[PDB]
Amino acid sequence: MQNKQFRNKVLRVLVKIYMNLEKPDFINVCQCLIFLDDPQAVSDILEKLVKEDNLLMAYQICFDLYESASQQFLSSVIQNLRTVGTPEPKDQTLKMIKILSGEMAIELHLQFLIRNNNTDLMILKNTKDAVRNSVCHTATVIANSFMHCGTTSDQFLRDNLEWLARATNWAKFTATASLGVIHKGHEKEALQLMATYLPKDTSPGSAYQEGGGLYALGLIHANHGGDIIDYLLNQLKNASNDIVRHGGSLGLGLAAMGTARQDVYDLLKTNLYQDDAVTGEAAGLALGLVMLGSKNAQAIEDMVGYAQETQHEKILRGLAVGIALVMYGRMEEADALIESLCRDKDPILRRSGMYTVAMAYCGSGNNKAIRRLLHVAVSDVNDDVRRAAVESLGFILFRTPEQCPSVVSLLSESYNPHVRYGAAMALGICCAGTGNKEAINLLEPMTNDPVNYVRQGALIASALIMIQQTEITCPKVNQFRQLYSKVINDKHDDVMAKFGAILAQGILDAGGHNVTISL
Amino acid sequence: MVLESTMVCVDNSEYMRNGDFLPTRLQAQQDAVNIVCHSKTRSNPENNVGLITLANDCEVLTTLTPDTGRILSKLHTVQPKGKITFCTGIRVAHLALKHRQGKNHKMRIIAFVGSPVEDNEKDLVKLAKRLKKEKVNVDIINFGEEEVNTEKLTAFVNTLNGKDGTGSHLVTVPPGPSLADALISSPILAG
Amino acid sequence: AVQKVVVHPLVLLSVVDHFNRIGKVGNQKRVVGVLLGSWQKKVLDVSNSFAVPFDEDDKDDSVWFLDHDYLENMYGMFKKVNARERIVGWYHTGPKLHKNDIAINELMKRYCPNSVLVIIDVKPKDLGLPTEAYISVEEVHDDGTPTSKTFEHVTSEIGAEEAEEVGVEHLLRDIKDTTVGTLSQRITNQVHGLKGLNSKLLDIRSYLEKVATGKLPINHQIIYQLQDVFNLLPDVSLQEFVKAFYLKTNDQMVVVYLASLIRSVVALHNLINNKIANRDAEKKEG
Amino acid sequence: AVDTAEQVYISSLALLKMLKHGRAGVPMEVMGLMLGEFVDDYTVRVIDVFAMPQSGTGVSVEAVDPVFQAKMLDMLKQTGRPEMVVGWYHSHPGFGCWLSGVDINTQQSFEALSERAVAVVVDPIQSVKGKVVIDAFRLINANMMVLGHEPRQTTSNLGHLNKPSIQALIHGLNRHYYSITINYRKNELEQKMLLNLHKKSWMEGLTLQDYSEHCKHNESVVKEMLELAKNYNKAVEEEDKMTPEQLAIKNVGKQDPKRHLEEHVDVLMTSNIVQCLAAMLDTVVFK
Ligand SMILES: [Zn+2]
């Protein structure tokens, strides 16, 4: 549980020993460069690649360092390596071009993921048998988007058009966005596929197709180097009703995530200056995404100054997540900010302090924030910070999956169902991708209760643990049978219980058991 | 038609019952208020007319309203106390002009002065500077006198009257047994 | 005439509305509201109230603006919908007692019956009771000063009859009831010293200031009764009260015997189940 | 053909006006009018709420006087109340909070101007003083019987709307008759002014008056409560002398629902007043 005051020095002084050996190792430079993130520690290893004249060994370090562990350090190292070289000359050019490409991973993932798909008619037929026109309509298309993610299998949605556009509401927006979740990583078939739907008059009666086209386009071009943002500014400049602003703001902010450009900040501010809650919520999410690591001076004070001067709540949650995602790496900085903003009169901003300090203290590096996290989770009377408090506890304690049920097992069956629901999300996020049974043996008391909150959160928490697990290792027949009986028992259950039931069933069938999740 | 507010201030001192002038001219100027309020009613019935005195303890007799049916009853029981009060007499109406219902109605306040002024020239130039500053139409009507008619009130009006183009007019009535209605109805302010 | 009054929080929350519908104009002066209540019974009971446009002048304090037509219309419609409550007086939100209040209250003294006056604070920073009933009655002074309007303090209480307690308790969900016991008592026994310390300490400063640096006689006659009541306890030697300390200490001994004996009775089920349950669960566990 | 997720904002103004209006809520049918401001599509805020004079006819379109309504609304427009009406409220005592044909007819006639037409019915007559949870009513379109009934998004708040779960009105008359969720809002001025006002409502004037009353009544009146408390203590110990026989015979199962412990703990809590106020008398005697 280092405090980063000496770990960076010990690492930066211990990385000088392997370069003097007969051959350099990758586990130490990776396991150090994932934490220190110092520019002076990469300038030597980026220039020694030319001196060593070894092409095979650089592909791995380029693949993983350009893969993860940094976003803005990659945004700076791409021009650091772009400056080095020509403004083996013929080989270093194709090397430096092909190392920062990043599309080869999308090609191979699209390849094996395009030839490993396995679909069954029982699941989709069961969804069509249990589909409702009111609530679970979005659950069916989001489950179909989960199971058909990456495989670009639109033939399932090419069967008929009377099942998607039968109602003019947000269901078509969730269906088009779900289609954006289906196919991803397309520079021509994306815009061409969206334009081929109605290339007759260029005036759709339902703007949810355009909003879902911009949001889906942002889902497709997320973290890509071939962004169409330049065209997204000329397309976003057009005046439209709550679809170019919302969908265009979400897609533009997601595509421009990590760029920290002042242009999207200016147009985003003038887009939120209309006092609207929807475009201010989407503008808050987009601003939080694009401000990853920027830490602008006047932005925080301008948003917290804009918070209490309005009555809507969607603007307070949009700016809440906006100021929550911007806080990254400010362990030694956000102390007075979170400590000062923790005693605010607004419960929404009170949740914004916990969500803000959640990602700031990742790695279980601070055991002091849990004092006020659980102190406000138990002491406060409003259930908002009570159900929204433990998400920070899981976000800071996601390292050890065994230590979580020992302290949240009391919150499994709490006094009010709100702490039971938020605690169910805590068990869902803390043990995700693992195989710890300390929550699985406690899932049985969670799934039987007259309140639908703990039942929904119990089905989601069980759906986040049953993924990527074999039956011969642990007897999952209990939760498989009691979870499969929810779609046949939905007639005697609540309207939302079947929504979270089939929505939980869409997690296991996501990608046909090929793709999983990892924290 | 014309959208403006009408405010009249009548004197309640004992100087209005002298036998040399009209026989208790309070009823005569009451009929003057009647013919100007009924005249403005015939021109535009949406105009509101208020009633207030200039005594030491100023009391709002009638709120600004076009309904004169109860104003006719409020014109009685004048309570003839006090002699004169100018500062809070101006401030009691010119500052209360913001309490009117219609914001489009112009500001117009008249006053019946039946007693000699007790304020010095400094209060005349300060209050005149305030009235000229806020740009409120002020009509000065002086009934009865003891000293010379206009000695400092001339400079008071000349320094108070702004916007010389179709601005305010001064009403000076000479002594005489004839009625004052036809004399005060001569300027354009009446009708 | 009136010994005590009853003021419901609905009128003070109507003052919260007076501070809500301002509109950020920058005036926030002493908005005068027309207080309503039941003057029939000897005790005064405020149910609700309304407002009247009131504006003063910056320099001149004697300027006051009221309205008779709006008062007769609000009183006529309010009396038509509820004839059980009539006009009683008025109230201002200004923390300072200005001289113009005799002219403002004099109107409701002539037209209306004897009006009660209530001074509150614009900012909820005063720890004391914000409501003070000040009756408008003329009292004869001994020094020979002319008879003028005197504001005598009448005690007040903040209580709700049927529903406002339920509404306030539902909207708060943080305040606690009486709950006789340890916490509700020890909180009062801890913070009461500040509850008297801020008031008395806040008063003795302006008091001692106006003692030496004071003019415009403030009825110094009452100060003789002030220091007299302050000297009604001339540091008693506690010689006679020793037996009373023996009585209260004897009751303390009774509480000691009740605590030790009763807790000793409570220790039965615990100090028995801890053995019979652990030994049987252990001998029968495997 | 479009619908959103609306939510009615309820402050303490309309709540307290419905509490006093509920106290004056005679069995005769009453009338009321709500005001507010429309900022967007899916939110509504109520600020001004007043009462209406009762009539022998009751809740009807003929009882609503247009010159009286427009007159009072004009008198509110000349003052610092620039808010337009948002709906009308009433009370349904005895026969339940459901709406009859006349109420839905005058609601259909009164909803021609405002598309929202918020309707709230307070009934504190048979409602216990423990909860004051109120519910807002809405009107559905008659042409929506072919399509879905309520295509409202954000189905999370329906769990909070399921608190009024009466098995006769909700689904006993759910056809062509639905409801909407209700939330509250409180600023710092209501929190500190109302919180300190309620604490002061449960406190003293100078906060030092009624302390010595109990501190000195511990020797006069509380002694009787201590002697009677010991009489109940002995009245339980006379059976506690018989408890070790059964506890010494069976030791299996519990038959007496009485705990005999928390009551004595409460007696100790009432007895600790002497200990807690002894230091108070020490401070009054000391200084
Ligand atoms: Zn009835």
Swiss-Prot record, chain A:
It comes from the Eukaryota. GO terms for cellular component: azurophil granule lumen; cytosol; extracellular region; membrane; nucleoplasm; nucleus; proteasome accessory complex; proteasome complex. The keyword Repeat applies. The keyword Acetylation applies. PC repeats lie at residues 174-207, 212-245, 247-281, 282-316, 318-351, 352-387, 388-420, 422-456, 457-497, 500-519. GO terms for molecular function: enzyme regulator activity; ubiquitin protein ligase binding. The modification N6-acetyllysine is found at residue 491. Keywords: Acetylation, Phosphoprotein, Proteasome, Repeat. The modification Phosphothreonine is found at residue 86. One of its GO terms (biological process) is proteasome-mediated ubiquitin-dependent protein catabolic process. Belongs to the proteasome subunit S1 family. Component of the 26S proteasome, a multiprotein complex involved in the ATP-dependent degradation of ubiquitinated proteins. This complex plays a key role in the maintenance of protein homeostasis by removing misfolded or damaged proteins, which could impair cellular functions, and by removing proteins whose functions are no longer required. Therefore, the proteasome participates in numerous cellular processes, including cell cycle progression, apoptosis, or DNA damage repair. This is 26S proteasome non-ATPase regulatory subunit 1. It comes from Homo sapiens (Human). The chain holds residues 188 to 748 of 953 of the full protein.
UniProtKB/Swiss-Prot annotation, chain B:
Keywords: Isopeptide bond, Phosphoprotein, Proteasome, Repeat, Ubl conjugation. The keyword Metal-binding does not apply. Residues 5-188 form the VWFA domain. One of its GO terms (molecular function) is RNA binding. GO terms for cellular component: cytosol; nucleoplasm; nucleus; proteasome accessory complex; proteasome complex; proteasome regulatory particle, base subcomplex. The keyword Repeat applies. GO terms for biological process: proteasome-mediated ubiquitin-dependent protein catabolic process. There is a cross-link at residue 122 (Glycyl lysine isopeptide (Lys-Gly) (interchain with G-Cter in SUMO2)). Component of the 26S proteasome, a multiprotein complex involved in the ATP-dependent degradation of ubiquitinated proteins. This complex plays a key role in the maintenance of protein homeostasis by removing misfolded or damaged proteins, which could impair cellular functions, and by removing proteins whose functions are no longer required. Therefore, the proteasome participates in numerous cellular processes, including cell cycle progression, apoptosis, or DNA damage repair. Component of the 19S proteasome regulatory particle complex. The 26S proteasome consists of a 20S core particle (CP) and two 19S regulatory subunits (RP). The regulatory particle is made of a lid composed of 9 subunits, a base containing 6 ATPases and few additional components including PSMD4. Interacts with NUB1. Interacts with SQSTM1. Interacts with UBQLN4. Interacts with UBE3A. Interacts with UBQLN1 (via ubiquitin-like domain). Interacts with DDI2. It comes from Homo sapiens (Human). The gene is PSMD4.
From Swiss-Prot, chain C:
The keyword Ubl conjugation applies. GO terms for biological process: proteasome-mediated ubiquitin-dependent protein catabolic process. There is a cross-link at residue 176 (Glycyl lysine isopeptide (Lys-Gly) (interchain with G-Cter in ubiquitin)). Keywords: Acetylation, Isopeptide bond, Proteasome, Ubl conjugation. It comes from the Eukaryota. Gene3D superfamilies: Cytidine Deaminase, domain 2. GO terms for cellular component: cytosol; extracellular exosome; extracellular region; ficolin-1-rich granule lumen; membrane; nucleoplasm; nucleus; proteasome complex. Component of the 19S proteasome regulatory particle complex. The 26S proteasome consists of a 20S core particle (CP) and two 19S regulatory subunits (RP). The regulatory particle is made of a lid composed of 9 subunits including PSMD7, a base containing 6 ATPases and few additional components. Within the complex, PSMD7 interacts with subunit PSMD4 through their respective MPN domain. Interacts with TRIM5. Does not bind a metal ion. Belongs to the peptidase M67A family. This is 26S proteasome non-ATPase regulatory subunit 7. The gene is PSMD7.
Swiss-Prot record, chain D:
Zn(2+) binds at residues 90, 92, 103. Widely expressed. Highest levels in heart and skeletal muscle. InterPro entries: JAMM/MPN+_dom, JAMM_MPN+_peptidase_M67A, MPN, RPN11_C. Keywords: DNA damage, DNA repair, Hydrolase, Metal-binding, Metalloprotease, Phosphoprotein, Protease, Proteasome, Ubl conjugation pathway, Zinc. The modification Phosphothreonine is found at residue 243. GO terms for cellular component: cytosol; cytosolic proteasome complex; extracellular region; ficolin-1-rich granule lumen; nucleoplasm; nucleus; proteasome accessory complex; proteasome complex. The modification Phosphoserine is found at residues 127, 201. Its EC number is 3.4.19.-. It comes from the Eukaryota. Disulfide bonds: none annotated. CDD domains: MPN_RPN11_CSN5. GO terms for molecular function: endopeptidase activator activity; K63-linked deubiquitinase activity; metal ion binding; metal-dependent deubiquitinase activity; metallopeptidase activity; proteasome binding. Gene3D superfamilies: Cytidine Deaminase, domain 2. Residues 8-143 form the MPN domain. One of its GO terms (biological process) is response to ethanol. A motif (JAMM motif) lies at residues 90-103. Belongs to the peptidase M67A family. PSMD14 subfamily. PANTHER family: EUKARYOTIC TRANSLATION INITIATION FACTOR 3 -RELATED. Component of the 19S proteasome regulatory particle complex. The 26S proteasome consists of a 20S core particle (CP) and two 19S regulatory subunits (RP). The regulatory particle is made of a lid composed of 9 subunits including PSMD4, a base containing 6 ATPases and few additional components. Within the complex, PSMD4 interacts with subunit PSMD7 through their respective MPN domain. Interacts with TXNL1.
